[PDB]
Structure formats: structure tokens, C-alpha cells
Specification:
The structure holds two protein chains of two kinds.
Chain A: no helix or strand
Chain B: E1 7-9, E2 28-33, E3 39-44, E4 50-54, E5 58-60
Antiparallel strand pairs in B: 1-2, 1-5, 2-3, 3-4
Classes of the chains: A little secondary structure, B mainly beta.
Bound molecules: chloride ion (CL) and sodium ion (NA).
Sodium ion binds next to loops of chain B.
Chain lengths: 8, 63
């Protein structure tokens, strides 16, 4: 899995 | 600093496997492995814990 995006 | 490359957190992060690190914006890290993809293994300075971090959440302290 890729890194998650920066928080909302 | 003491000479070691350090990174800083750009955002808060909550860990999503037992092997991940949780951290606050402003946390500093030594990076231990950036070779196996975009999750890097790091050591947190304020806690001393090691674990994976998402590499998009950090930037070098130098600027
Ligand atoms: Cl600790
Ligand atoms: Na150095």
C-alpha cells in the first residue's frame, strides 16, 4: 500500500 | 545539530499497523531505512521509538 494522503 | 540527517513531521499521524509509529507535527526523526518503498523506517527523537512512517508526512530539517 502507498502512504496515505496528508490529513483532511 | 550533531551532524545526523534529521526529518521533521509536517502533519500528525496515527499508526495503522503494530510496526508503524504515531507522531505529532514537529516531531524529529532519524531515518533508518528509506529503501523499501514509500513507508520509511524511522526513530522518533522525543520518544526514542522506531517504526514505519509515511514518507510524504516528513521533510528534511535543513529546509
Ligand atoms: Cl518510547
Ligand atoms: Na551531516
Amino acid at each position: 500500500a502507498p502512504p496515505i494522503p496528508p490529513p483532511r | 545539530g550533531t551532524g545526523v540527517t534529521l526529518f521533521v513531521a509536517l502533519y500528525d499521524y496515527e499508526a495503522r499497523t503494530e510496526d508503524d509509529l504515531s507522531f505529532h507535527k514537529g516531531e524529529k526523526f532519524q531515518i533508518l531505512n528509506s529503501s523499501e518503498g514509500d513507508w520509511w523506517e524511522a526513530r522518533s527523537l522525543t520518544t526514542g521509538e522506531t517504526g514505519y512512517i509515511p514518507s510524504n508526512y516528513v521533510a528534511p530539517v535543513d529546509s
